[PDB]
Design a protein around this nucleic acid. Structure first.
Lengths: 49, 77, 1264
RNA sequence: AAGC
RNA sequence: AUAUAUAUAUAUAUAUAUAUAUAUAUAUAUAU
RNA sequence: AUAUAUAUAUAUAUAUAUAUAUAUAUAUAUAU
């Protein structure tokens, strides 16, 4: 789930950068990051999500 | 220059072989080695150890020569 | 290649899985095959564009060879002998030029035979002529050791490989076997043939015919060429069929070329036969990384050879190779013959493998397959003068002060003796005592069986018997005008029918004729064919040895067929941490003489029989009186039993020696008599006696001598931990020692080495040369195991080679088909790539399916349709529009396989048949509305099916013979067989009872009265056939082919009424990543899948089938299976127990146990395998190496999966159908390609009762 | 001549 | 078939240490 | 003093375990 091999972290820096411009930019978590179809506690993958 | 334990064992084996030869058989019926007795501590005289308890890694005369040659002085320049 | 594709477009496309097979295309290809010529085949060879990698130098030395004069000389006995230049063994055919001895053949001026004029001076008595003719005849014999002209095999290979790579239906890809452009052996073959032929327009270096061989007149022809060509063609076939690595094939070719360039090809091959084993198998896994080793367990009693499979154990560096390194020996051997390079690359390649997987075993198998496979040939005179001229070296003999006075010929051995012979004497003493006490020994039927055992249709040196009897003025009946061979032991028995033993006593001291057999990678073997009285008097020896082998030791009785041996023993012994020791006795027969062995065994047997046998005759031999001198001073007389009389006479014979008669057909003026002490090889007591002495000596070493001759405590502990009943298995001169791995790993190799030295020393003082191998590998009966994986030896199944030892011409045409099918099955067992092998087998079957015949201006062609081969067990490729490569050669033979493949493809067959206009209106239970009755006739399928069952050998029966002489022969045979009146009365009672009750139910009741007729027929069939019998063959086959049929046999029609239902696959039997048989790997899908789905047969077959019969042994001439089938037929058809009693009485069983067994059989329930024999259903020979029993029991469900159906009901008293239908299910499941599948019965068209009635009808009607 |  | 993300496999490249055997020198026994 | 066998020191040669990184293609999934 974490995929450590990936080497892109623009999201992390952008999250910090957004703090200065709270008044015009609203940073939210993309909906694709949420558990699929609401998920369930019976699924390990959903738990990790 | 062998370990005294080792020479004791080898020397017993030699005796067993000589006994076998005397009896004119492939085996010696009477053996001095591989008996039931655990004679592990048995020692035998060897040329490995001098009279001082030191090792004979170097001959005694050689030690004397090296010791006495470290003090000699020669004619002045 | 253009003409190849032009001629065989349709055939290649059919047999390569592109188009449906058909009879007409097959026959067209057969005609094309028949229409080629030799030079045409070579011109076809010229068109292959060989690549650079297939290039290698050829030394010029092969073509230029000296004359044969310096290699022969004449001894002081005026006998031609071979001059030896390389040592005592350089007695094989030298490599010399021949062309200067050839007379040109008429109409074939380019070819010729040995000069007839030289033959004339040879028969006159000239020396040089005799030398020349000996050389010529022996060269011809060496060149005649093939099955058929090599051009047939080469052309068939070309046709098969013209189809390109094959598509794998399981792997869903294409194989990557390199094409002919990388086949080095073919390039070498073409180049050498072209260089020999040169400018002359004919290309064949020689011509192989039935009458012999004709040589091409070239100044570069050499006697060594034919074997070289045979080896090259074998290697070329093997590389293309089994996907061998070309690098190793090049090394094999190099070895062959070096052999050719030497002074003697055969001698060179013999001296260098072990490079590949010693460099790959015996030096394997020096550094080990990983892999799997099977976990097997040896249960109790170990006498039962019961092993059970557990699983896999990961390997580790702890179990690397630990045997002594053989690098120095291998390098020395390679240097001594100038092959140090080949050894270098072999070792370098071997070091590269660190894991135990499919790859390593495949590499080992490929390396072993590259050894030459010729039949070594040498003149009989040198064989006799080399093999019978060595004697045992009894380094420590029995003291002369340890014997008693003589009892006739024997001499009793004292018990105070310091020699080790005392234990041998005691063992044979107890063996004889236990043997003689068995009541079955005195049963007349047992003695009759033993008497009949050695009465066979094979030679017995009857002539020497004849003058030996004439030496005392006794005249035997001549049987003038009998169309049978007088040179058979049946003829000897007929002539010896009514003579007293006192009259035939002198016959044992007669001479012995000659007999030879050639082997692969082994010197030719000689045989002494003992005559009838000798076989009769040799009985007690055989009985005692049989008792020892049966009870007091571990000893097998399996044959040389790979299926019947004990694979579990080898696989268990090779697997770590167990270690194996390979022990063989060099020149075993020559090492057993009167000096040490015979003088003890004979005395022991004679003494250990007197009590349980006093005053009784035996085998026709009566009691007698002998002088007694055992005790000092007192010299008296003593009665002895019949066995003791035989022992006295046999002791006389053993003390004297043996008188071998030689008649060298390849050498004019080379015939004489040789006095020898070598133990005979042709007697019935050879193997059993050798095994018994092997076991006894091994036990004596392990118990007394060995413990008393070594002092190292580790060796003492090891030896005290070993016993023969637990660790040693012997058979003849071959033996195997198993060292069980300890709980701390495996036994230290140094201890094993010192023990081996002890055995080597111990063998010498009684003149036994122990050939001992300890290299981390297990070998038994020429089966090779490493780390629990068996390695098939391809080189010992030559594809083209055939053993011919005599000068007789070869066989008529149809016989070769049996050899071809045998080659196919040998390839099946050896585990070749199945698709390529099937394609190549089809090519050969096509190439040999046509034959010209002359019927007196009626010039016709004999042609076998493709279906006859299928009936003979060769699987199809693609037909009736079906998918290609859907059948497996685990297909059964005969009716079973036919039924199986029809059942698999019935619907497609019906749709195909309808779509082609073969439409009718009468709906059929099997084929619906298909007009099969005509399509099968025109497709010749009926014709092929029916002619595949005709006897393809000439039937010498029916020859004209006078009534008086024939009846005299028969009555003489019967009188010889029926000695004791009790047996005759038993048989008469049986006949009367059978007429009372069993008459009319079956038409062929086996009986002892039929043995003389069968013996006469067998003797008559042994004679040489003549031309009109061959014409009888031809007209019979034409009659069968031209006829039209309407149905198969009743049995097959009954079988087709049954249909099944396939289901989910089985469960894996073994781990998928464990190598078991080399080559059976994922690149060899179908065998691999069948093996992992069914599982290997983990129990020896001889013991398994020992319990599938009622009578263990019967009289020679009758078949136990026939008797069992008759009994079960009688029981099934409702005959009462008195009929079975009568039947048992005919075969001579005594009345009481006859009744007991009859009742028991009537009420008993029998096994599936035993019960299925009523309809001649036998387990396919290819299934023997698989666990078919469990699949019979728990994977052929006779109840439909969805529940009980109306038609699948078995009538209560017809339970044997339960046995039959299991075979049908087995055939259906095994024929299909892929994994084994659980199968359920589906429906029987007519219901169970109708099927039972049809089967009973067939059972009653057969035998008419 | 050509075994078990 | 095209594009993207995740993973397996082959090939090329790089280092240390140790042990075994052989040979030379010295000696004992037998032989010269 | 020399040769064969055995032992020690020294030198040379030979043999051997394990590990790490990137791209493409391929496989799986998504979109057309």
């Amino acid at each position: 789930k974490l995929r450590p091999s990936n080497s892109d972290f623009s999201s992390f820096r952008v999250a910090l950068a957004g703090w200065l411009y709270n008044g015009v930019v609203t940073t939210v978590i993309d909906d694709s990051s949420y558990p699929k179809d609401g998920g369930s506690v019976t699924s390990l993958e959903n738990l990790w999500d | 220059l062998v370990n005294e334990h080792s020479e004791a064992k080898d020397e017993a084996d030699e005796a067993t072989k000589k006994q076998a030869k005397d009896t004119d058989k492939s085996k010696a019926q009477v053996t001095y080695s591989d008996t039931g007795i655990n004679n592990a501590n048995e020692l035998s005289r060897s040329g490995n150890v001098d009279n001082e308890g030191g090792s004979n890694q170097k001959p005694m005369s050689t030690r004397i020569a090296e010791a006495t040659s470290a003090i000699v002085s020669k004619h002045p320049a | 290649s253009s003409m190849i594709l032009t001629q065989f477009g349709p055939f290649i496309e059919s047999i390569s899985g592109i188009t449906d097979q058909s009879n007409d295309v097959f026959e067209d290809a057969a005609k094309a095959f028949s229409m080629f010529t030799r030079s045409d085949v070579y011109k076809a060879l010229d068109e292959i564009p060989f690549s650079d990698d297939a290039m290698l130098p050829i030394p010029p030395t092969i073509y230029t060879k000296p004359s044969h004069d310096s290699y022969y000389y004449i001894d002081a006995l005026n006998r031609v002998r071979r001059k030896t230049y390389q040592g005592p063994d350089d007695v094989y055919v030298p490599n010399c030029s021949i062309v200067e001895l050839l007379e040109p053949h008429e109409t074939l001026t380019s070819y010729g035979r040995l000069s007839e004029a030289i033959e004339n001076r040879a028969k006159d008595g000239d020396s040089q002529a005799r030398i020349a003719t000996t050389y010529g005849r022996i060269a011809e014999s060496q060149a005649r050791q093939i099955k058929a002209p090599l051009e047939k095999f080469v052309l068939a290979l070309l046709v098969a490989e013209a189809g390109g790579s094959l598509y794998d239906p399981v792997l869903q890809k294409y194989d990557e076997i390199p094409d002919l452009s990388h086949n080095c052996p073919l390039w070498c073959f073409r180049e050498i043939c072209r260089h020999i032929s040169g400018p002359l327009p004919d290309r064949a270096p020689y011509l192989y015919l039935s009458a012999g061989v004709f040589w091409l007149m070239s100044p570069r022809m050499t006697s060594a060429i034919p074997p070289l060509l045979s080896d090259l063609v074998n290697l070329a076939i093997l590389q293309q069929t089994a996907g061998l690595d070309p690098s190793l094939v090049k090394l094999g070719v190099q070895i062959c070329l070096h052999a050719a360039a030497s002074s003697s090809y055969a001698w060179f091959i013999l001296k260098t036969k072990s490079i590949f084993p010693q460099n790959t198998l015996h030096s394997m896994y020096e550094s080990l990384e990983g892999g799997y080793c099977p976990n097997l367990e040896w249960l109790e009693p170990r006498s039962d050879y019961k092993f059970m499979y557990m699983g896999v154990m990961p390997l580790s560096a702890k179990y690397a190779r630990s045997a002594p390194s053989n690098d120095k020996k291998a390098r020395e051997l390679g240097e001594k013959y100038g092959l140090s390079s080949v050894v270098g690359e072999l070792r370098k390649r071997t070091k590269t493998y660190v894991k135990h997987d499919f790859a390593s075993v495949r590499y080992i198998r490929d390396a072993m397959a590259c050894t030459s496979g010729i039949f070594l040939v040498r003149t009989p005179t040198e064989t006799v003068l080399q093999e019978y001229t060595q004697s045992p070296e009894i380094k420590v003999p029995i003291p002369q002060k340890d014997w008693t006075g003589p009892i006739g010929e024997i001499r009793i051995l004292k018990d105070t003796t310091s020699s080790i012979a005392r234990y041998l004497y005691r063992t044979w003493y107890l063996a004889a005592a236990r043997m003689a006490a068995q009541p079955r020994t005195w049963d007349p039927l047992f003695q009759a069986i033993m008497r009949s055992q050695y009465v066979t249709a094979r030679g017995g040196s009857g002539a020497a018997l004849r003058e030996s009897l004439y030496a005392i003025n006794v005249s035997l009946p001549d049987f003038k005008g009998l169309p049978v061979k007088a040179a058979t032991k049946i003829f000897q028995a007929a002539q010896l029918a009514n003579l007293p033993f006192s009259h035939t006593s002198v016959a044992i001291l007669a001479d012995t004729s000659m007999g030879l057999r050639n082997q692969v990678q082994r010197r030719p073997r000689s045989i002494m064919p003992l005559n009838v009285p000798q076989q009769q008097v040799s009985a007690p020896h055989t009985l005692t040895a049989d008792y020892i082998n049966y009870h007091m030791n571990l000893s097998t009785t399996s044959g040389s067929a790979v299926i019947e041996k004990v694979i579990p023993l080898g696989v268990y012994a090779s697997s770590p941490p167990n270690q194996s020791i390979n022990i063989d006795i060099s020149a075993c027969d020559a090492s057993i003489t009167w000096d040490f062995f015979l003088s003890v065994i004979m005395a022991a047997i004679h003494e250990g029989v007197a009590s349980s046998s006093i005053g009784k005759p035996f085998m026709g031999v009566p009691a007698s009186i002998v002088n007694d001198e055992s005790v000092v001073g007192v010299r008296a007389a003593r009665p002895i039993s019949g066995m003791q009389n035989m022992i006295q006479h046999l002791s006389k014979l053993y003390k004297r020696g043996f008188s071998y008669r030689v008649n060298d057909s390849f050498s004019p003026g080379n015939d004489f008599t040789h006095m020898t002490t070598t133990f005979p090889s042709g007697s019935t007591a050879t193997s059993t006696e050798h095994t018994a002495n092997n076991s006894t000596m091994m036990e004596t070493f392990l118990t007394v001598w060995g413990p008393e001759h070594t002092d190292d405590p580790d060796v003492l502990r090891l030896m005290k931990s070993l016993t023969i009943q637990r660790n040693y298995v012997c058979q003849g001169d071959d033996g195997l020692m198993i060292i069980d791995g300890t709980t701390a790993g495996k036994v230290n190799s140094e201890t094993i080495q010192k023990m081996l030295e002890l055995i080597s020393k111990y063998g010498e003082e009684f003149g036994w040369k122990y050939d001992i191998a300890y290299d981390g590998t297990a070998e038994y009966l020429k089966l090779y195991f490493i780390f629990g994986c068996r390695i098939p030896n391809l080189s010992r199944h030559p594809i083209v080679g055939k053993e011919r030892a005599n000068s007789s011409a070869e066989e008529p045409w149809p016989a070769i088909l049996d050899q071809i099918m045998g080659v196919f099955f040998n390839g099946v067992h050896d585990g070749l790539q199945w698709q390529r092998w099937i394609r190549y087998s089809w090519a050969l079957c096509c190439a040999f399916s046509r034959q010209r015949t002359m019927i007196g201006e009626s010039v016709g062609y004999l042609q076998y349709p493709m279906w006859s081969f299928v009936y003979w067990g060769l699987p199809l490729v693609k037909a009736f529009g079906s998918d290609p490569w859907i059948f497996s050669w685990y297909m059964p033979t005969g009716d079973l396989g036919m039924y199986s493949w029809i059942s698999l493809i019935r619907p497609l067959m019906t749709r195909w048949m309808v779509a082609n206009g073969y439409v009718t209106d009468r709906c059929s239970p099997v084929f619906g509305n298909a007009d099969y009755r005509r399509c099968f006739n025109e497709l010749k399928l009926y014709q092929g099916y029916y002619m595949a069952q005709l006897p393809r050998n000439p039937k010498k029966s029916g020859r004209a013979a006078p009534r008086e002489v024939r009846e005299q022969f028969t009555q003489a045979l019967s009188d010889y067989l029926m000695q004791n009146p009790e047996l005759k009365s038993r048989v008469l009672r049986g006949r009367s009872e059978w007429e009372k009750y069993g008459a009319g139910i079956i038409h062929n009741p086996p009986s002892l009265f039929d043995v003389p007729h069968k013996w006469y027929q067998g003797a008559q069939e042994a004679a040489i056939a003549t031309r009109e019998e061959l014409a009888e063959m031809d007209e019979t086959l034409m009659r069968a082919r031209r006829h039209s049929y309407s149905s198969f046999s009743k049995l097959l029609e009954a079988y087709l009424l049954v249909k099944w239902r396939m289901c989910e696959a089985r469960e894996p039997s073994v781990d998928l990543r464990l190598p078991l048989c080399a080559g059976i790997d994922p690149l060899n899908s179908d065998p691999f899948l069948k093996m992992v789905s069914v599982g290997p047969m983990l129990q020896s077959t001889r013991k398994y089938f020992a319990q599938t019969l009622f009578m263990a042994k019967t009289v020679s001439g009758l078949d136990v299976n026939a008797i069992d089938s008759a009994l079960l037929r009688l029981r099934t058809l409702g005959a009462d127990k008195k009929a079975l009693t009568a039947q048992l009485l005919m075969v001579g069983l005594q009345e009481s146990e006859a009744d007991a067994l009859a009742g028991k059989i009537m009420l008993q329930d029998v096994n599936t395998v035993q019960l299925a024999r009523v309809v001649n259903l036998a387990v396919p020979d290819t299934w023997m190496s698989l666990d078919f029993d469990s699949m019979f029991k728990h994977h052929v469900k006779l109840l439909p999966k969805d529940g009980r159906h109306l038609n699948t009901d078995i009538p209560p008293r017809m339970g044997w159908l339960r046995a039959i239908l299991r075979f049908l299910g087995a055939g259906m499941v095994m024929t299909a390609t892929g994994v084994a599948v659980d199968i359920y019965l589906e429906d029987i068209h007519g219901g169970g009762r109708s099927l039972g009635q049809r089967f009973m009808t067939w059972m009653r009607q057969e035998g008419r």
